[PDB]
Write a protein that binds this ligand. Structure first.
Ligand SMILES: Cc1cc2nc3c(=O)[nH]c(=O)nc-3n(C[C@H](O)[C@H](O)[C@H](O)COP(=O)(O)OP(=O)(O)OC[C@H]3O[C@@H](n4cnc5c(N)ncnc54)[C@H](O)[C@@H]3O)c2cc1C
Length: 335
């Protein structure tokens, strides 16, 4: 037929990024986006948005580092472009502190992020309960702004957004050629894999524009991130908690920790708490599965289980997923 009919389930940041890379990799494409919840309210919108490579347990550290590099150098061109307002990608400076001096003070992502260095004595004076610190400048992406921009790009490519429920993948078989699974935590029901589980995270969005440097205490328990609209203050990592009701004691402990780290936070307004379910998987599922039970073929390339560090690597993972897509499309062309 000389045309390929693609499909991407998932409206998260990676669900759209994958279709972007597919539209710019595969020669002949007709990729569509099909998800229950789109860019107004996805788990990628509630996300803080800082580009800090959280260490994946089950992925090669050089592969993960390269993913962060490929993502960073794309967002870095975005921040220097004219569309940085609409795409919502801005350079954010700040510091990563530590309770005790680590054995090695250089991570695997020092030479990619801008100007990795140590905190001076005068900089260590800003935090009395802390011995060692690091200083650097990264990029933060606003989800309620970045994801709509990706939508406006894929619309130019030729895709469209359908809002329907997909209980099982076989609904796409009698029409679509290949399916791209980017449903995130939802894929637990889609692909049946039980490895992915939800890590609950609650963040208080407070408004205080004087804060302009981010502050992360190394532990995931305390992060203070500046935002273009709401300063994002959070440190909750409950595991297996599907509960999306904002619990109050978390809003107490997060505020106490973050207020201790940055004191000027005392005079702040509009302390509105939201929650989210990180789709956690030891290794981000990125492989081509060919499921077909007493029927015709159905190639499905999986792409989920991003965890707490999926945004900082969403472009590299998109590249690898589009690689599998191109390989399988070639397998369909040639016999
Ligand atoms: C509070 C919080 C803070 C975070 N902070 C950071 C951070 O600073 N840095 C970082 O790198 N990462 C961070 N993350 C992680 C990051 O937000 C996610 O891991 C990642 O964006 C999710 O990738 P995804 O697009 O596959 O999943 P999602 O964003 O959840 O996208 C999945 C989408 O697929 C669709 N879908 C789902 N199920 C179905 C179904 N059954 N049928 C049809 N469509 C379906 C829906 O539209 C859904 O929104 C954070 C996460 C949370 C919760």
């Amino acid at each position: 037929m000389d045309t390929a009919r693609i499909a991407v389930v998932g409206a998260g940041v990676v669900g759209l990024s994958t279709a972007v890379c597919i539209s710019k990799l595969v020669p002949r494409c007709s990729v569509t986006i099909i998800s229950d919840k789109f860019t107004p309210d996805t788990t990628s919108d509630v996300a803080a948005g800082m580009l800090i490579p959280h260490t994946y347990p089950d992925t090669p550290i050089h592969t993960q580092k390269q993913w962060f590099r490929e993502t960073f150098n794309h967002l870095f061109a975005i921040a220097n472009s004219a569309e940085a307002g609409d795409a919502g990608v801005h350079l954010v400076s700040g510091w990563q502190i530590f309770q005790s001096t680590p054995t090695e003070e250089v991570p695997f992502w020092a030479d990619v992020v801008l100007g990795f260095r140590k905190m001076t004595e005068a900089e260590l004076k800003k935090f009395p309960q802390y011995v060692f610190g690091q200083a650097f400048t990264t990029l933060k992406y606003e989800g309620p702004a970045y994801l709509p921009w990706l939508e406006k790009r894929i619309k130019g490519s030729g895709g469209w957004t359908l809002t329907r429920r997909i209980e099982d993948l076989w609904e796409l078989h009698p029409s679509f050629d290949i399916v791209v699974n980017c449903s995130g935590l939802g894929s637990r029901q889609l692909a049946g894999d039980s490895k992915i589980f939800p890590v609950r995270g609650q963040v208080l969005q407070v408004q205080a524009p004087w804060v302009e440097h981010f502050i992360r205490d190394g532990s995931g328990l305390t992060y203070i991130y500046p935002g273009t609209s709401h300063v994002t203050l959070g440190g909750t990592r409950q595991k297996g908690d599907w509960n999306l009701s904002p619990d109050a004691e978390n809003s107490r402990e997060i505020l106490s920790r973050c207020c201790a780290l940055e004191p000027s936070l005392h005079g702040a307004c509009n302390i509105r708490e939201k929650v989210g379910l990180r789709p956690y998987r030891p290794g981000v599922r990125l492989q081509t599965e060919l499921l077909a039970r007493d029927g015709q073929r159905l190639p499905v390339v999986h792409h989920y289980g991003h965890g707490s560090g999926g945004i900082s690597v969403h472009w590299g993972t998109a590249l690898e997923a589009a690689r599998l897509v191109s390989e399988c499309v070639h397998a369909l062309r040639t016999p």
